């Protein structure tokens, strides 16, 4: 006696019991109700568009400092302001204010990095294989 029915004709209860208990899982609940993407940083998207508001570390005396590579960006989808990392100060250059930037998941609290500016990859500009259209 394991606290469960075992009769050969008790298939019904085992199913009904299983369906009820399956809702206990958070993973099962999120998958069925489609609320798993609330927790995602971009609300289910793989990348985030934004506007460059300011370059916080532009002044910072120390080259290639963690502050220098941070840029404040406002997400277009919701308008919430966040920070993004830039690969390096040279890449901090191609970014200028009011440019469109595509963001991707990555000083603590900065969880985003810039992968495109003005519709072109930052690495492409950094390797200098392309030129930013304005």
């Amino acid at each position: 006696g394991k606290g469960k029915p075992r009769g050969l004709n008790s298939a019904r209860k085992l199913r009904v019991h299983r369906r009820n208990n399956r809702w206990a899982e958070n993973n099962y609940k999120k998958r069925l109700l489609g609320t798993a993407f609330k927790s995602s940083p971009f609300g289910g998207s793989s990348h985030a568009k934004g506007i460059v508001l300011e370059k916080l570390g532009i002044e910072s005396k120390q080259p290639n400092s963690a502050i220098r590579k941070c840029v404040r960006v406002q997400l277009i989808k919701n308008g919430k302001k966040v920070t993004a990392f830039v690969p390096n100060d040279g890449c901090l250059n191609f970014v200028d204010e009011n440019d469109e930037v595509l963001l991707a998941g990555f000083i603590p609290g900065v969880r985003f990095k810039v992968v495109k500016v003005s519709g072109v990859s930052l690495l492409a500009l950094w390797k200098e294989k392309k030129e930013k259209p304005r």
Binding site: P87, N88, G90, C91, W126
Partner: peptide
Amino acid sequence: KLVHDVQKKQHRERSQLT
């Protein structure tokens, strides 16, 4: 590693005055 090769160029010592 986002440093270009040019950024790591060798810097040569100034020669002493003749």
